[PDB]
Enzyme design. Sequence first.
Site, short mmCIF file in Angstrom:
data_model
loop_
_atom_site.label_atom_id
_atom_site.label_comp_id
_atom_site.label_asym_id
_atom_site.label_seq_id
_atom_site.Cartn_x
_atom_site.Cartn_y
_atom_site.Cartn_z
N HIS A 95 1.93 -3.71 4.99
CA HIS A 95 1.31 -4.41 3.86
C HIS A 95 2.17 -4.34 2.60
O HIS A 95 1.91 -5.07 1.65
CB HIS A 95 -0.15 -3.93 3.61
N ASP A 141 -0.42 -0.92 10.62
CA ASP A 141 0.20 -1.11 9.30
C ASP A 141 1.54 -0.35 9.23
O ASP A 141 1.62 0.74 8.71
CB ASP A 141 -0.77 -0.67 8.22
N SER A 170 1.26 3.48 -1.41
CA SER A 170 1.26 2.87 -0.13
C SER A 170 2.64 2.83 0.50
O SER A 170 3.60 2.65 -0.22
CB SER A 170 0.84 1.37 -0.26
#
EC number: 3.4.21.5
Lengths: 10, 252, 28
Positions: B43, B99, B198
């Site tokens: 992502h 992910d 992230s």
Amino acid sequence: DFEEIPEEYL
Amino acid sequence: IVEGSDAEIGMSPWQVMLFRKSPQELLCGASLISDRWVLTAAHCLLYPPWDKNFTENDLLVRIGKHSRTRYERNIEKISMLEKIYIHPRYNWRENLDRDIALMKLKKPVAFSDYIHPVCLPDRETAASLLQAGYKGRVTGWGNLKETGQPSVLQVVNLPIVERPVCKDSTRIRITDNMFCAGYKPDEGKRGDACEGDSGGPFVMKSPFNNRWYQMGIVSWGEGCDRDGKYGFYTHVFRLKKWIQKVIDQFGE
Amino acid sequence: ADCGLRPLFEKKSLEDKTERELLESYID
Ligand SMILES: [Ca+2]
Ligand code: NA
């Protein structure tokens, strides 16, 4: 805000 | 990182910053897994609901850093990307299942006191360490609060949570390719990843061989450090066949 | 061969400030 990096990297 | 602390110098020498070239900004974290390969969350590179789709030349990786904003002359190294590889079954439409993404650098980075790769788990590593209550460590230069930014790399240690508890905290469908970590309300201690963290690593130090393994990738959470919510992490071991396939096919 | 061994910690037998918290959690 970020310190500029060496031109060779861009 | 919310409710963390400053990292020590050289504490996370596999930490990588993903840096947007123009405008110059922090995009996400990542990790060094060899002299030419960097691991991150898909992502961070591809997320159509926000019109995010980066190509190799949009980005740089900065390795060996401690300060967020400084150019750390004679310490950090800045590398260009040769190619991005996103998991072909990355589920950006629903729950960010799988992910995970790999980035091959144009040239190998030299290791140093500040630049060194993390290990990837094998099946036994995962079985021994991915247990509820066992703690791992999350690092990043993301925000200090949900609603500023740190001077230096932040670190927080967080326990892995029981799967039924993770499932009961969210409406999202949790897959076997995810795990969650964080303290429960009643445990009173706190900490979480937040915006900008992230793609960074969740690591554990094996008590068997004294090495650090990257068990997770910072994937998603519902706010930051909210009571009764947990952070969700990509389960690296569950995706290792893909990791190895890509490195075996495209590494040099 | 040397993955996961940090130059300023494991390869000097120095411990960081909170790794013991991790070790203490690996009880069983
Ligand atoms: Ca649920
Ligand atoms: Na929480």
